[PDB]
Amino acid sequence: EEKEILWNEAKAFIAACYQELGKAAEVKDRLADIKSEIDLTGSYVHTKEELEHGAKMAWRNSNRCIGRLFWNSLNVIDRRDVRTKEEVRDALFHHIETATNNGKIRPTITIFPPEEKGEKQVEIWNHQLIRYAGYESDGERIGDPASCSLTAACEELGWRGERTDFDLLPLIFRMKGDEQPVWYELPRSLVIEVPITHPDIEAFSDLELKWYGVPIISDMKLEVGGIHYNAAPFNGWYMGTEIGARNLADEKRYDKLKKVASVIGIAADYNTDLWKDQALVELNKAVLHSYKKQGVSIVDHHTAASQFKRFEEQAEEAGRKLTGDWTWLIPPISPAATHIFHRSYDNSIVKPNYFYQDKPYE
């Protein structure tokens, strides 16, 4: 059964991949090769062409992603050759450097060896490669609450955070054969951060807010033609609302709205004053302004929605079915000001794609 699943997915992937690459005449022979290889070894190995396009198709099929217009320009780094934790660490460091690109962010994915018998070769513990630690003890909340369980895990393994609101978590991953993951502190020279200021309101800096430049998802599984790439971190640039409307605004995250209201000089007493709404807008203006002043790539939700419309149009012109998750595609502020809000999307799952997987901690 396990191998029949692999063969079925491989058949579907290769046909589709080779179609798009105008290599349709080579499907027949390559399928035989794969079929023999699965019979002999219990698996098959992607060509670099197949792997690159698979990772691109996977982004294109990500229903919850508004930034899919640029699926075909994804920078794919092939690291199936790594065998040591030093090599994984350096590959991860390199990803941060080249994706950051001095602020001109390059959408990039680094692909590590895939699962064998469902056996992971490399197991990344980080949710993102760059993220802030979180602490909760004796009514004391510090940092990012979403990071509380990973933070406590790292601190088991001998790491200690400074207990600032923005402690950088170490890279943490486990190798096949090892019982414990290893952790490495991030070189600060690799991590761009942006202080949040407001274009009009000088007092905004009193909040001492900041965020990191590059969101690098490192805990999802990339599936291509029946092959499970459990370790394959990828990044784009931020949409402003992810930071200003969620990361810094959610009560279960940094919960900054009351403080924003105070520094922008409005009362936070009456629901009918819409003070949360006003604070959200100003905080979001601040995030966009700050990233642009520093020369770090970012997109606002209006521009992003316009780009996504072009993605929709391109899908139609290419004769591709479009899939999407309305609940994730709408931005968390002024969603009805985007075209997305006013139409519906088929939330079917097409492969290749990126998938959730169970956390090794918790």
Added chain:
Amino acid sequence: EEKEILWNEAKAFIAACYQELGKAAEVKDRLADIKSEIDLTGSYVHTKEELEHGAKMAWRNSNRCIGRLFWNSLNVIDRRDVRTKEEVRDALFHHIETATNNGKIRPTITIFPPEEKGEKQVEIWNHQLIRYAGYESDGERIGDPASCSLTAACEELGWRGERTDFDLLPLIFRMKGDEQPVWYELPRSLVIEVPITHPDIEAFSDLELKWYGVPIISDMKLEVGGIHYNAAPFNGWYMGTEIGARNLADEKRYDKLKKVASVIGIAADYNTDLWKDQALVELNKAVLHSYKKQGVSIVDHHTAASQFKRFEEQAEEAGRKLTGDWTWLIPPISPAATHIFHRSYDNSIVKPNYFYQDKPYE
């Protein structure tokens, strides 16, 4: 088949209705009565108790409604006794008066005779009892574009609008047996309107915006125990966002955001300035302020969401399954600031309920 459907729905409704009313011992006899009545006549007649509670259950089951906390206090007016267009007109006039209640809006429903053989006794053409006309000719847009097709229909029948941006449409409905609907102009003394001003920005009045006090949906079908009440208009009070984020903001409605931006003194040139978002917030603050100053009932989306949370809690305590449409329940501004955004809802259809029906025009 038609009558078996009626009997099945009746069985399910009466059992549930009489349970909630603590009249469970009377289910058996009432079902026989209904069963005989369907056999003899092809239908059955609700007691006033059944009708009132049915209309209440129907509101409680309305998945897309955030204001369901107050389902049990709905004011039900039984007008199954009407036979003449004069009686329907006066019933409609009365609904507007008593629901408006000098600004202290009473959630009310007026229930007209139900369909017989799927044959309507009364056929209401209005989408809401109080709404603005819309015109489109020679590139000229006036009023509410959502009303363009009904407006053109009324103007076929001898009505003529003043072609102001806020022409009140006449009541328009057709009686069984008549080929054409009749129309009656609304007495202005019955219709409360609210001029939109802003609490801080004096120039806001230059926009000369206004809206009507009471949203009275008059084109949906109320279904109770297999009986189709196609004509049964109902009202609540407005949630502010319905007016400020949709009716006045949508490009396909009044499309006022650029004008709002100008009068609040901000540029409408760059997506990254979030000018639409800022304009939306101020326009929505204006709507809430204006309704409150005039003494007309209204609720903000934060307070409404808090109320809906209590509805959720009450459903659980009563042992009732909760149903809802996430896509309609989230407010169109700052949705992630409400609890609704952060959970999921089962969108199953439970009866009694209100349903869409085909328009007699278009």
